[PDB]
Amino acid sequence: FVRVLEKRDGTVLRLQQYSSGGVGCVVWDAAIVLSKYLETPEFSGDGAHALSRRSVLELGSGTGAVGLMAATLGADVVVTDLEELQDLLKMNINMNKHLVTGSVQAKVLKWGEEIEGFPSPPDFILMADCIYYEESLEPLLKTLKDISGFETCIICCYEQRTMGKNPEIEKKYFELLQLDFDFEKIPLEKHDEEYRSEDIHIIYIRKKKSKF
Numbered sequence: 001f002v003r004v005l006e007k008r009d010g011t012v013l014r015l016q017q018y019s020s021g022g023v024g025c026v027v028w029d030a031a032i033v034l035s036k037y038l039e040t041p042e043f044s045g046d047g048a049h050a051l052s053r054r055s056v057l058e059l060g061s062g063t064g065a066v067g068l069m070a071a072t073l074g075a076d077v078v079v080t081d082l083e084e085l086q087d088l089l090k091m092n093i094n095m096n097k098h099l100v101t102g103s104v105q106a107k108v109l110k111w112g113e114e115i116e117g118f119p120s121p122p123d124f125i126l127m128a129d130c131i132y133y134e135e136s137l138e139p140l141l142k143t144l145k146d147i148s149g150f151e152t153c154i155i156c157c158y159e160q161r162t163m164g165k166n167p168e169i170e171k172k173y174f175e176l177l178q179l180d181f182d183f184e185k186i187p188l189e190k191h192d193e194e195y196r197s198e199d200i201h202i203i204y205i206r207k208k209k210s211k212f
Ligand SMILES: C[S@@+](CC[C@H](N)C(=O)[O-])C[C@H]1O[C@@H](n2cnc3c(N)ncnc32)[C@H](O)[C@@H]1O
Pocket: 025, 026, 027, 028, 029, 030, 031, 032, 059, 060, 061, 062, 063, 064, 065, 080, 081, 082, 085, 109, 110, 111, 127, 128, 129, 130, 133, 136, 139
């Protein structure tokens, strides 16, 4: 009942998906793509967004897969989700703390609700498959605006769902996003050569600050 995700160095993250009492969350494909993206040279010492010793907030962590990966890369990570997912997050911190080279802790952060502030804006905010929640889009973007500063690197990874109401929900997300943020799509050629998909996008989001 463990989902496994292997790092570039052969070490292996292990993620439980069921917490006792109905509460649970699976590891989503977008979390695998973003996690393995964090292991590309882009987030190494000689890279554009070195992760080691930097502050990282993850929203909608679920199992914690992405934030845990960042913690095995030297970041000081806070993984967050709803109250009911805190037990699962703590279990997965326990299963992977032997691989953590930075730090990792879990906190409740329900989108739209103000929580324990950072002393200064995080260096990164990470999100995997956080966007198809129509009812929580304005809350999510409020949290993002409240926490990020002009230097925060916001990385948003999501699997594009092409059927149903999802195309519509996706457009509402971007229309709300553009009021306060810029974005830029990371070309597929920069994802992990193995763990990528034309259906799974990575976008860098930045708090807008125009000179005009
Ligand atoms: C599709 S899952 C993705 C989980 C994980 N990031 C991954 O990719 O494997 C979305 C996550 O967002 C969380 N979430 C949904 N609405 C939320 C809200 N209003 N506030 C905080 N978290 C929320 C869910 O509990 C769930 O863990």
